[PDB]
Structures are given as C-alpha cells and as structure tokens.
Amino acid sequence: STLNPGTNVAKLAEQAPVHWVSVAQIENSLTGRPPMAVGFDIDDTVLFSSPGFWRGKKTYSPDSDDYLKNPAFWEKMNNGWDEFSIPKEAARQLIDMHVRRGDSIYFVTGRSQTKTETVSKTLADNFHIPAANMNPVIFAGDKPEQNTRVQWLQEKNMRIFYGDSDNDITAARDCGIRGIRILRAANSTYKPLPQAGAFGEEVIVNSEY
Amino acid sequence: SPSTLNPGTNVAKLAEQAPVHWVSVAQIENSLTGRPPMAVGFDIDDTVLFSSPGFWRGKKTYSPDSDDYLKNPAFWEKMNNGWDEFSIPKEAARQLIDMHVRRGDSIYFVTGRSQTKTETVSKTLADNFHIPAANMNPVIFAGDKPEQNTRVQWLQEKNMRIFYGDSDNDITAARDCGIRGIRILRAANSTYKPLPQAGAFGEEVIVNSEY
Amino acid sequence: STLNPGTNVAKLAEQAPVHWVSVAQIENSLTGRPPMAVGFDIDDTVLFSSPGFWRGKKTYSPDSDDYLKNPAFWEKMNNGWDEFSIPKEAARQLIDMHVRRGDSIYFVTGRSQTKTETVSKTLADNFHIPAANMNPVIFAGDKPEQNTRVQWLQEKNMRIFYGDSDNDITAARDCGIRGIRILRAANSTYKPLPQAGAFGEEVIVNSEY
Amino acid sequence: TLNPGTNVAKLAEQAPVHWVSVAQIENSLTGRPPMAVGFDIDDTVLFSSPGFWRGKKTYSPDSDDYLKNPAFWEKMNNGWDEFSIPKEAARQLIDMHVRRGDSIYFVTGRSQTKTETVSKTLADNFHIPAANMNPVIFAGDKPEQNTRVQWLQEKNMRIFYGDSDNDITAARDCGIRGIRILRAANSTYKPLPQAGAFGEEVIVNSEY
Ligand SMILES: [Mg+2]
Ligand SMILES: [Mg+2]
Ligand SMILES: [Mg+2]
Ligand SMILES: [Mg+2]
C-alpha cells in the first residue's frame, strides 16, 4: 500500500467481537463434574507439525499439495517426522488440567491412516499423559473402513472437542457438544489462517504457541 | 517499565489477549430476535454521554482539591440543567438506542446523579439520540448511596430485561436482578478514574464502545 | 454470515510501521542541549476542547461547520468555554519536562483571533507553567494581519513542534525542525482522525489522553 | 482473578518502539550502489526450532547441554534444516536486496562442522542467484574462527539483520545499521528477546 500508512487510536483499540476464554475459566466451568471423555485435534492444536508437512511438500509436491494424497508421504509423517513437531504450551496446560480431573483423553486426526504410527507414543511422551488417561490416536475419514470425526465424537461420548479448523468446531456443533477453538500459529504452513470465533465459539487466549 | 528507557516488546506480548467476552451491537440484536417489545435501561455518564466536561468544571469550581463537589447541591443544579450541552454523545450508544427503537422497546435512563428540582437531561438525551416519544421515558435520578446500590429498585420495578453501563455497580445491579448486564467501555480521557475492568464479572462487553 | 467475523493471530499481532516514542526518550534525546523554544498546537494536542466546539456547532450550525466562521462562536470559545476543556496527561508530561529543562514554551493555534482571550490563562493554570517559561497564545492563519503557522515557528526559532494534525507536522517539516505527533482522542468531534505517522514522524505513545 | 477484565487505555497502549517495514527500508536505500548486507540465520531467516527441538529431546531432554554436543551439530548442519521453515519476512528482505544487486551474507553462531548443507538449503528456499549468494559464515570465539564483529567488518557489511540482542550489539560495535527481526512465539529458544531494547529499528510482522 502506502509507504507511511500511519495509524490512529480507534484502529489501535479496535476489537473483533470474539468470545475469549482462559484455561482457568474452562477448568472452573467443569468443577464438580465427574471424569469424562474429551478430544483434541492434533495438527496446530496440540502439535506444530508444519515441519514435516513442509518437508513432505518440498519432497513430493514442490508445486502443489499433491503430497497429501501420496501414501509415501504419510508413512514418514506418521512414523517419525513428528519428532520434529513442536508441542504447544496451550495444549500442555489443557492436557495437564484434564489429567488432574481424571478425564479420558482422545486425539482425533484427519491425517491419512497408515499401517503403523508412532504419533500416539510421541503424544503420550511429550505431554506426560498417564496410562489410564491415554488413548491411541484415532484416524477419522470417509474411507469405508473408518468412521468420520462426528462418528468418533459420538461413539466415545466426548463432551468437549478442541481444534483450530472450522471443521473441528462444526463437528462438535453437529454432535451437540462444546467445541473450543485453538489459534493456529502464524508461521504454520497451513494457510490461510482460519477466522477463530466465526461460529460464535469460545476461543482460548494466547493459544498460538 | 516506567523506569525503563527502551523497554522494547515481543510478539507474545503483542498478540496477548485478555479473556473477555466481546460482543457487537449486531450480535446483541440477533440474540433478541423473536423477543417482543421490552423495557431496557441505560446508565448515563460514560455510557451514553461523555459528560466529563461538566464534572471537570464542577470539580474545579467547587472542589479543586477533592470530590466533595459530588455532594454539593449547587453543582448538581448546574449539571442537570445545562452543562450537558457540553456533553458529547457516544456513537456506540447511538447504535444501541436505534436498535432498541426499531424493536419498539421502552428505553429508560437510570443515573447515579443526584436529583434536582428541575432537569434538562431528559430533553438533551431525547434530542441527541432522536428518541420517539413512544419509547422515551424521563430520566430516573437514583442518586448514589454508600453501602447500597440505588439502581436495583428501579430495574426491578420497571421490569428492565437488559441494562447497559460502564461501571461495576451498573453490572452488579443487573446481576443482583438476574437480568442481562452489558458493559460499555469508559473513555480513556474521562476524568472518572481509574478506568474499570470491563469483563470483571464475566459479562458481555461491547467492542469499540469507548466513543 | 458476518455476525461473527472472528480473527486470527496474524491480525492480532499486526503492527503499523510507525516510529513510536515516549516522553522519557524525548527527554533523553535532549540531554546536554541548552534551553530552547518549543511550540504546541492547542486543540487535541494539549486540550480536549471538543466540548466547546460541539456546543458551538449545535448552537450556530447544527448542519454544517459554518459556526467556525461565526465571530459570535469564537468570542465564547476563546473567553470561557475552555473551562470545559479537558487537559491531556501526555501534554502535562511534555510541558513539565520542558519546564524542567528551562525551555521557552509557545502555543500556536489556528483558532480565529478575538479582541480578548482567556485561553493563555487557562493553559498556564492547568499546567502550572511558571511565568518564566510561559508565553501568550499565538493565533495564526491565512487571514490578514496575521502570520501563518510556519512564519511563527521561524520567527521564534522553535526547534520542536508538537501537534495532532497533518499541517502541524508539515509546518515543522517546512521549517526543518523536529515535528512530533500527538494522538487525537477517538471521541474528538473533529473527524476523521488523522493517520499519526503518515510522514514518518515520531508519534508519542498513549498520547490520546 | 478468573475474570481479570481490561480497559481501553490498556487495549491501545503501545511500547515506544521504532517500527519499520521492508518498503521503508528499501526507500531508505534509494540511490545507493550495491553493498554487502548480512543475516543471522536462526529465527531471522529460518524457523529452525524443529531441529533444535529434536536435538534437545535426543541429547538433553532436561537442559540445553545438547548445544555443546558434537553429535547434535553434525545432524543439525547436514540435513535437519530440511524441516526448517523459511520466514516470509526474510523472503521479502532478500528479494529486495537481490533486486538492488547487493551481496548477501549469512552469519551464524551455530557450531561449525566439517561439512554443512545449510548454504544449499538457503540458496534453494530463497532462490538466491549465484551472483548474490555466499557460503554460510560460522562465527565463533575460537582462535580458528573470527568473531561475528570481525566478519561484519571483514566483508564490509552495512546492514545486519537478527532476532537476538547480540545480533544488534554486534552491528552497533561495527558502527553499522542493525535491524531487528521478531522471534516467533513458538520458537524453542526462550525467553523471547525484547525487540527495540537498544532503540533499534524493528521490522513489523516479522515473526513469520
Ligand atoms: Mg488442526
Ligand atoms: Mg457511568
Ligand atoms: Mg490540533
Ligand atoms: Mg537468531
């Protein structure tokens, strides 16, 4: 645009009409409630996994997103590239809180399913999730041999679902449960960034890291 | 820091957000779809009017050293019968008032200002915000009592379902009554300091409502 | 649809390329320099005078800005209505700083001149400016029998000029001196707000009040 | 403190920092002949935390002792940057300098290894022409290496970009223009530095 655009105090103080919440407010809202099942999306919700996706694109689809359909990419992505995935502090706080409550923690992902996967171990290790609270990662999808995200949220009777994408929130709404938004990091390679709060959902403050 | 010449900053601090429930007028309006006409209330000072000019002159005239002017009947006479000619209407309030007029709601103004024999505040409000006679109601001067919230009785008796205000006591009054209390941001240049912590009771706060 | 526009972390952290400064930094930049002459714009720079201008318009030109040409308005505005004007904290800090340095303070305004004025008095009293550093307000304009803003900056050899409007900054620029921007409050009746920093000038932080 | 709230003074509050854009930097160089400019690497042009994270988890999960482990650097400098995400802000600065015909140098505090593929990763990701590219320079306080300051002087760099305090003070020591880049909030190198602490120019939106 212009070289010296400047600014004004109206622009400096302008706020989008979003419902922000803190981990502490979420915990307070669960007080007295018995252990329950809760779910987390993985990519850009608990793990900054862009490193692997970046290398995958560079390796199999420099000029496109075809790598996401390449089975060769997924074998490596689900079996080791998450060693380069950075865990989010927001997720750490949320998981620690649910662990203290004794809730059952599930991880649901849209990643293509592979024969083996080391993601479940990476997650349990990174977030120090006790055995009684950990559950193997769930690969949701359309495939005839797998259930959809909505189906899994219902089957496991998850009462809360955390995610950064619009489909994460709509799935929660579709099931009639509480969908909570996590901010996607600005340096994520999955762009453009989604509009957190676009469904009137709660959005966790400072959850980009 | 105030003692730090070049404090600098970082992206974590730049993007940092307070956990507040922000709402827009449109969202409020939408949340009232299907609701029949109802009674709603508005605080006056720093909610619908930036009245600091008159309170500032009042302090300088009667209590330059203190806030005793607020207990001076001479001050209230001047404040309620003319000084609001210097009071600037808030745009956020214009939008709320128009929205409620469209719905056909009865609008009330409940203020902590002291009651005076005569008052021109009601007219200033009706003229500045173009409030039809059908929706307008004379201002209720509830006064301000120590250890007691004067607004509660009025919200109950007039059966107000929503109450807008910038001060904590406006929100706690709505909470005491079990109705929806919505916060309006007090301007940074208001002479009524310190600024309150909007969202301190988990209430909805209207975005960009400082002007 | 757009009832919930939401937001994202890129937008939350976005910054306009503005050269922000604080009063302490300004003070530090003047260390060792002998006392000098500095000038201040009045409206929305040192005084939030919108109350008087608002009443002026509603009284003399409820449909336009013609009131700005009405001598009856200026008689009221320059002789008492500033008793309703709110002094700015940023200005207070700047003036105290310059007084400490022993600088000579001047106030230049584009307000129409009147045979008498009590503005100078209101300024000296509100800001406790000692007689030694105080100077009667200077009224400038394109009009006759008057010197323009630029002419007054040159004649008094003002080395710094503080203002909220673009012409305050350009005037300083035209005289080769240091022009520093003050933010105009969002509730000022003089709209639209200007783009502070539009000339690459220094802008004082939190100077809207 | 469950509901701390906020106020408009807080919402509009600005830190006294000198912000600049790539366009303003380019404008300030108008009419200047080609010159040498240098860039720090980690968190300046590359979000290299993925590699440092794996290194930490592998060699010293409870500390930063891995930064002094030779085995770590061998892998970091020879392939782990394939997981390093280039920064858009750097992409713009580099294109800008390449258009000017300036000579670009990359100076890093990473431990030097026998071989390195970092220079290759940089040239490819940022499509730097052969005419403007220079092999990465490893600066160090070892009698075999030259310090960061010496390299800046040696190559007569006029501008140095970096996210760290020592990147800025190095430029200040050489009497050249040191410009700050914002370290991403999710970098594993914490705490984040205070950009602007030396009254230096800081590039807006440079966290990605
Ligand atoms: Mg995701
Ligand atoms: Mg009030
Ligand atoms: Mg002005
Ligand atoms: Mg660095």
GROMACS .gro file of C-alpha atoms and ligand atoms in nm, chain D residues 40-44 163-164 167, ligand 4:
model
    9
  669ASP     CA    1   2.158  -1.406   1.119
  670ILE     CA    2   2.006  -1.747   1.041
  671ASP     CA    3   1.812  -1.899   1.329
  672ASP     CA    4   1.479  -1.720   1.391
  673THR     CA    5   1.586  -1.449   1.145
  792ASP     CA    6   1.643  -1.153   1.621
  793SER     CA    7   1.890  -1.162   1.913
  796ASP     CA    8   2.298  -0.961   1.673
  841MG      MG    9   1.897  -1.585   1.571
   0.00000   0.00000   0.00000
